[PDB]
Design an enzyme around this catalytic site. Structure first.
Site, PDB file in Angstrom:
ATOM      1  N   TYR D 119       0.797  -1.030   0.055  1.00  0.00           N
ATOM      2  CA  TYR D 119      -0.149  -0.043  -0.034  1.00  0.00           C
ATOM      3  C   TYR D 119       0.961   1.307   0.234  1.00  0.00           C
ATOM      4  O   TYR D 119       0.427   2.341  -0.420  1.00  0.00           O
ATOM      5  CB  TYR D 119      -1.070  -0.190   1.118  1.00  0.00           C
ATOM      6  CG  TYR D 119      -2.010  -1.158   0.746  1.00  0.00           C
ATOM      7  CD1 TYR D 119      -3.056  -0.744  -0.610  1.00  0.00           C
ATOM      8  CD2 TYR D 119      -2.296  -2.417   1.163  1.00  0.00           C
ATOM      9  CE1 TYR D 119      -3.873  -1.650  -1.037  1.00  0.00           C
ATOM     10  CE2 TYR D 119      -3.484  -2.989   0.666  1.00  0.00           C
ATOM     11  CZ  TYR D 119      -4.275  -2.813  -0.131  1.00  0.00           C
ATOM     12  OH  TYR D 119      -4.989  -3.592  -0.499  1.00  0.00           O
ATOM     13  N   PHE D 391     -10.835  -3.319  10.128  1.00  0.00           N
ATOM     14  CA  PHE D 391     -11.795  -3.460   9.096  1.00  0.00           C
ATOM     15  C   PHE D 391     -11.039  -3.675   7.803  1.00  0.00           C
ATOM     16  O   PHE D 391     -11.620  -4.266   6.799  1.00  0.00           O
ATOM     17  CB  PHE D 391     -12.316  -1.874   8.978  1.00  0.00           C
ATOM     18  CG  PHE D 391     -11.672  -0.777   8.408  1.00  0.00           C
ATOM     19  CD1 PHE D 391     -11.551  -0.506   7.430  1.00  0.00           C
ATOM     20  CD2 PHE D 391     -11.057   0.034   9.658  1.00  0.00           C
ATOM     21  CE1 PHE D 391     -10.457   0.663   7.008  1.00  0.00           C
ATOM     22  CE2 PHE D 391     -10.102   1.030   9.235  1.00  0.00           C
ATOM     23  CZ  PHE D 391     -10.066   1.491   7.847  1.00  0.00           C
TER      24      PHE D 391
HETATM   25  C1  LIG Z   1     -12.422  -7.415  11.444  1.00  0.00           C
HETATM   26  C2  LIG Z   1     -12.288  -7.263   9.844  1.00  0.00           C
HETATM   27  C3  LIG Z   1     -11.233  -8.318   9.335  1.00  0.00           C
HETATM   28  N1  LIG Z   1     -13.529  -7.373   9.035  1.00  0.00           N
HETATM   29  C4  LIG Z   1     -13.392  -6.802   8.055  1.00  0.00           C
HETATM   30  N2  LIG Z   1     -12.639  -7.307   7.201  1.00  0.00           N
HETATM   31  N3  LIG Z   1     -14.132  -6.022   7.603  1.00  0.00           N
HETATM   32  C5  LIG Z   1     -14.931  -6.326   6.498  1.00  0.00           C
HETATM   33  N4  LIG Z   1     -15.038  -7.538   6.493  1.00  0.00           N
HETATM   34  N5  LIG Z   1     -15.325  -5.365   5.592  1.00  0.00           N
HETATM   35  C6  LIG Z   1     -16.300  -5.739   4.744  1.00  0.00           C
HETATM   36  C7  LIG Z   1     -16.955  -4.474   4.312  1.00  0.00           C
HETATM   37  C8  LIG Z   1     -17.933  -4.506   3.417  1.00  0.00           C
HETATM   38  C9  LIG Z   1     -18.641  -5.649   2.966  1.00  0.00           C
HETATM   39 CL1  LIG Z   1     -19.798  -5.329   1.876  1.00  0.00          CL
HETATM   40  C10 LIG Z   1     -17.994  -6.733   3.498  1.00  0.00           C
HETATM   41  C11 LIG Z   1     -16.960  -6.892   4.246  1.00  0.00           C
END
Ligand SMILES: CC(C)NC(=N)NC(=N)Nc1ccc(Cl)cc1
Ligand SMILES: CC(C)NC(=N)NC(=N)Nc1ccc(Cl)cc1
Ligand SMILES: CC(C)NC(=N)NC(=N)Nc1ccc(Cl)cc1
Ligand SMILES: CC(C)NC(=N)NC(=N)Nc1ccc(Cl)cc1
Ligand SMILES: CC(C)NC(=N)NC(=N)Nc1ccc(Cl)cc1
Lengths: 391, 391, 391, 391, 391
Positions: D119, D391
């Site tokens: 990144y 996230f």
């Molecule tokens: C705790 C973490 C690893 N959780 C995430 N990776 N965030 C995540 N999965 N994010 C995500 C965002 C939008 C959608 Cl539609 C699907 C998944």
């Protein structure tokens, strides 16, 4: 903080403390079955409102040398919230339960210790010894002398409950350390014999008219079979069950938690194949009433009549006369010939620890080496002390 | 192949077989010192020319219950070339040495076994038990009752040889399993106390008027101290030495190879900190002359006079009378009340194994349970059996 | 004990023995699907009443060199109760099934061995070799020569069943070791592709017109992908699938159970990155009818016509003429030029083991080195021998 | 290949790529809740038909030094099919999202990186540091100075959701790195607090008026408690929660993923017991609009007014004046006094990395050491930078 | 027991205690070289006759912020016999040396701690932080910005002693934590650079005009190179040495014990490849004279003039005025605005620990948050604090 018998409203608070305190906490359902063994007034809680400490005892029956069965208060479910350490909660709960146990007429209390350094100062001494043996079955050959050179059947445990119950009942009456196993604990045992998703594999049983073994393959080591329980009432049954376990041709190793006098190693041409992989204290005993406990058990017939004066630290002084396998234990103010803390007496009581070994650590004090030899011989158990089941 | 006493010309061939057979083979220099303990005619070799098998015995003095010292033939340096396996060389060499030992007047032979499955069939029974205890010294606290609450000095072993020799000499005369340690073996021990490039760290000693401990930090685990030998003649000395070992503040763990009745765990507030990490057979015994061995040792005074008939498989039948701590063992053709192979008798002889435990494996056969209790009590040792040094 | 074809009433007893004998025993549901491949009279049980031994064969189709498909009896579900070891049950069950297989007209039997030392003495020789390759994909770069420098799709296995079935069907007809995979085994495979609570992660597929790979991330090592099965009918498909597997950028390692001639290592600039982590016998063969098996397979066209006399130990002597890629194998009493046990022939039969290698162990005996070179060349397979699926 | 906003018909294709790309992919249900944080036009897909690449951003609120909350585009769900590596899909998807983020008015973008080397070249710099501390609680003693020498309660997380939400909301507004946690993420967190068959053990909570800790025993190491999240708004709350965690008497070790300035070690008499077991980049930042980001955050009051000219590589040149804790950042063509790539600015922005450290690697270039000291002091954060949630 | 300066006759007794106390005790020869750094009256012993405790200090020169060099008493060779624990020997020896150090005019004392929990209560605070970085050099690529994109030579250390001495001398005068390295310690360092039979492999050096690195392959892990010491006076030298270390193509990993602000990670395209594998306290400081220490060091120019009142627990109260990078520290009885134990001041003194971090643990107490920010900024070091060499 207040200490009291719990109301029905306290039990959800107790089950939260239990889940947070015990990794082996199946759940509230298992807890509610064990709860049937707890007498009225068998439980204390400390509240801050919320439960921050708990302790109880169950009504048990413990076999002691001479095949004598004693009413026994089994301490269990003892926990102090991580928020409330170092505030004397454990000492306050143990003092109240010990008052209730003694007032109720129990001669002995017993427990399994989560750590070795806690229960000594409350008068509990380790009284059974757990001995794990691991056999490399690939090399195991039975000695020419070994019995049973097909009396054993491979069965599903849940289909032979009646037979397991009857063998266990014969075993527990014969062996010091034996405990009566009530129906609710057979219910639990046979529910744990089922395979669980992400958990234990299925248990199988090996069934002889005079013994059984329950075993399962280890969750992760697929070449290890763990024997959860082997109860044999005869030497023939013990050898026949081990012949069958050594015939588990897909395993490399068979492990069992047994006792130090298990004859298994002597059944093999190579005694060294039955390796001791772990040793630990099993059942702990607190003698609640010194004369009732010492008069209740049987003693070795091989030692001739002798008399002494035993002082238990803050537990009385007694004229102790042992002969023809029986003791008489009466109040005296005569000079003590033997002194020890209460925990030491509990360690001697089922024959797992020698008086001469405790004397060498100065846990038991006498000036008479002949008296030590006599106590060692008298307190010895003909039938080796075993551990029934954990609680 | 031929079997004979080696000539001086055979010894280089024996030292090659030794280097190839034993990883602990210091070298020809160490071998030549042990060689001073081998009597004339104490060695046999098999030649194909080249040495393909060897065995010898050393002249030892073994302490047995009652503080009695027996002349003992210590089998050692036994090896068969990897080229000559499965040709009956070991059986032929053991038969010839056993003939020479018996003819020479030894009542007992002894060895340390490289594996558990070999020596049983030649009449050796495991007679001492090695018990490794590992203490997490960071948590170890001495019990309020423990003695010695500065009698011990930290010293260089080579500067206090006289004091170690005198303590060891007192120890070995008092304890069943004790062996006389000749000057050449003290020479070897103190040479191994030196640090070696790529090998062991320096040994230190803890010295009390009535005991010593020799220890070194492990080669690779710098937080483990290994006690190579602790000899204590009194309980005060044993506790004082352990107080000093638990004061090795830079270690996490102290390990020792000791015996099952070591009182160490009882010295601590947490008995569980003295963990059993390893258990194995130590000294093995072959009773060469059943009556001479059974009449020589002392028996427990606590058991009343009793008489029985003992048959050793291919080793005679005897009227055995035990009373006032002494046995009389005389030829008889009366019906046997007790039968066992020779190896089983050697296992019973120093009190390390109970008659009732061997009976439960059918290694010892009687129809009288009272006789079993009497044998168990009589053959018990007041002073727990220990292992002196390996050979 | 009695040996017989099981009745419907025997199957619960067989499923108990199976659960106790096989850790990979999904359950009675999976067992009932495999059961559709067992012919009438394809199963034997031993009863003591209770099932103490079982064995059966399935009807299989095995591809051999020359793209010839043989009816094959696949031995499976073989188990002896741990209570009934060393009573000749396995020998009795194998003798009866082998009688039934031979009488039924099968030229070959096959199995996967739970251990390497059992099946030799019943005439089975290891005929395929399993080779595990583990690739450190972080360093893997494709050689400039490697094909395919997006024909592959990442898909859900259950949505592309038809395409997997058609590719597998092309693969199994082309490769020695190939087995027809019936509908019930595709049902099982796609049910195992689902994630299980506490068990395997979800499987994904990589799909090419001429090949597929099924893979999953390891349960516990989250940086390892395990390829359960890669079937490629062309070199282009094989390289394209590996390009996609090396693009699993979140993994450190990709492992596959493949065959010794897998060209994968040659696809990379560093052949050493495709590391051999495990090697083992795969499919074992018992030649049931020597002439039918030797006449059925194709032979190398590169070796000129030659004639010899082959004796199989207790399996006949034959005039063996090999030319233009075909064998004629007829009874003879002429002197043998080549001798071997039946198991050795099964090891040679798919080209996995060289005659000259077995000769060097004296498993195959001739005095003619030219004849050995000719047999090595003739029995070689143009298309490397692979292992289809375990049973 | 084509790049576009996904239709509803694309989402099953995206969830397949997600399952194949992310081991932590709970399932389509969890995915659909996170999907509520994705704005209209917040997602791009690449199609070959089938989804071979995807990326999106969520609408977040990030706290920066001075307690300023910035609208933040949180990149997530970024994946390229293993079939489509090395075709520029990631660069094309990042270029399109960055265009949309910048056009939408976000001053900053943020992500958590699956690897450290991706990144940087897209302008993201690591801006928070994750620091795992493992405490050997058996030896942990609180310093005489430590606060709180029972304000904490042990509770079930799902019964105190309101209180956790309110404490977290206070924490996230005060600490740089803090993120607003929307209702759907509290739903997810409390669903993960449940025990799963074959998965995580039950979570418990420690609750103070001004802080909470969520923890669970490790799946496999039953003597390790893992703190999933500790949020303390006061020093008293932080110390009180750690007193309770160190009171988990059945554990040997407590582990937490925290920040480098966690005061925990200073609470103990032995600072070394709080061991750093792991360190890694946490949140990464891409400054989208240099003047909006630099004018928005607060700066250290301790540094006197200063002016400089900052050039961001391909991101503008600015007259940067910092005084009284505020920056003014205006276009200039004056000669640059400081130059750096965009990623470096993101690393400086929350105070986790010193300008002088980046200068020593030549990632930031100036000829003025006084200017470096001034930038280091100005960009420092009074309140240490922490990581909210992944996230 | 008596405490006194040792006579020449005490030193053999001290070397025995040293060998028994320190695993890194090279021998009496190494000890005699370090002994040249011990002043007359720099050593105390406790005798029971035999040496049971010892402690000494060496004359050192320590660089503090502002490039100021302080005379420093380096405590070392501190040991209490395992026979004499818990008798107050360490407290008595530290009290006497601290009296002698203070009377002699040293403003600071320093040590390296064998454990974290001992030296706090004697007024020592950890003042440097050791940070081990392990680089997977197989993936390491230098950033486009990294300097030096052949100034370094691979050399034998013993042939370039003069050059190492001159670079080290420049380094130690510039960096807080720097220590003067006397000739006898260069003698020791270059003697340890030799390979030892059973010990360390040969050391090599990488030599730049403005820096050097000494390294060796690990004894047992032949793919790990350990950097024993890297001293770089310029950023160009630091980057050039790391380019050479990353060119050790036969290694997988390079490890170094460095400081938290090492710019290495920023030199690479993947900052995560420089992994933190270990963190620990390095040098500990006891401020002996509060005003002399606080007036001697330089302070950050970025913070404006401020005045406060500092109380050290049992170490005086002072009016502390800091401005233009200088402190004035004078006696006062005015009310304290800041209070802390002596150990806390030592932790702040070289800039390794922030005042605000110690305040959050209540180790430093003020009611003024503005004063805390000012102390944090003032006590910060421009040049990151490093650890010179252990003693
Ligand atoms: C705790 C973490 C690893 N959780 C995430 N990776 N965030 C995540 N999965 N994010 C995500 C965002 C939008 C959608 Cl539609 C699907 C998944
Ligand atoms: C096998 C052991 C560990 N099981 C037990 N600990 N016994 C146990 N859980 N005892 C217990 C007793 C009463 C009640 Cl109400 C709840 C639990
Ligand atoms: C400590 C043990 C293993 N040492 C011995 N094995 N004893 C030993 N090596 N015995 C031995 C005896 C005689 C001769 Cl000639 C050579 C060696
Ligand atoms: C993949 C392998 C191990 N699966 C098999 N073992 N095959 C198998 N279980 N075979 C089998 C065959 C018939 C019956 Cl009735 C029951 C089981
Ligand atoms: C590298 C370190 C561990 N070396 C030292 N410990 N320093 C050291 N041994 N110091 C020391 C000082 C004086 C004397 Cl007399 C003897 C030893």
């Amino acid at each position: 903080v207040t200490l009291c018998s719990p109301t029905e409203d306290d039990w959800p608070g107790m089950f939260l403390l239990a889940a947070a305190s015990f990794t082996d906490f199946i759940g509230p359902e298992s807890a509610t079955a064990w709860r049937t063994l707890v007498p009225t007034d068998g439980a204390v809680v400390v509240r801050d409102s919320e439960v921050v400490g708990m302790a109880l005892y169950m009504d048990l029956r413990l076999t002691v040398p001479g095949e004598v069965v004693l009413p026994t208060a089994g301490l269990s479910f003892v926990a102090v919230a991580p928020t409330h350490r170092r505030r004397g909660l454990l000492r306050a709960m143990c003092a109240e339960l010990h008052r209730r146990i003694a007032d109720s007429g129990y001669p002995v209390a017993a427990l399994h210790a989560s750590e070795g350094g806690i229960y000594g100062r409350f008068g509990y001494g380790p009284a059974t010894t757990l001995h794990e043996l691991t056999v490399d079955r690939r090399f195991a050959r039975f000695h020419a002398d070994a019995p049973g050179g097909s009396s054993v059947r491979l069965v599903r445990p849940t289909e032979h409950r009646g037979e397991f119950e009857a063998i266990y009942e014969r075993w527990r009456q014969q062996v010091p350390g034996g405990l009566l196993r009530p129906q609710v604990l057979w219910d639990e045992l046979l529910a744990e014999a089922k395979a669980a998703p992400g958990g234990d594999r299925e248990s199988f049983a090996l069934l002889h008219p005079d013994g059984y073994a329950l075993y399962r393959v280890d969750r992760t080591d697929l070449k290890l079979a763990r024997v959860s329980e082997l109860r044999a009432v005869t030497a023939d049954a013990h050898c026949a069950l081990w012949r069958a376990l050594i015939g588990l041709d897909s395993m490399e190793r068979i492990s069992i938690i047994t006792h130090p006098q298990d004859p298994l190693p002597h059944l093999l041409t190579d005694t060294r194949l039955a390796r001791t992989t772990w040793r630990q204290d099993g059942l702990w005993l607190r003698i609640m009433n010194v004369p009732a406990a010492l008069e209740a058990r049987g003693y070795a017939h091989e030692v001739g009549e002798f008399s002494t004066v035993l002082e238990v630290s803050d537990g009385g002084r007694f004229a102790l006369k042992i002969g023809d396998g029986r003791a008489r234990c009466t109040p005296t103010d005569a000079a003590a010939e033997i002194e020890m803390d209460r925990d030491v007496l509990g360690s001697l009581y089922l024959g797992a620890h020698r008086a001469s070994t405790l004397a060498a650590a100065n846990r038991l004090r006498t000036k008479d080496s002949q008296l030590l030899r006599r106590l060692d011989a008298a307190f010895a158990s003909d039938v080796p002390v075993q551990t029934a089941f954990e609680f």
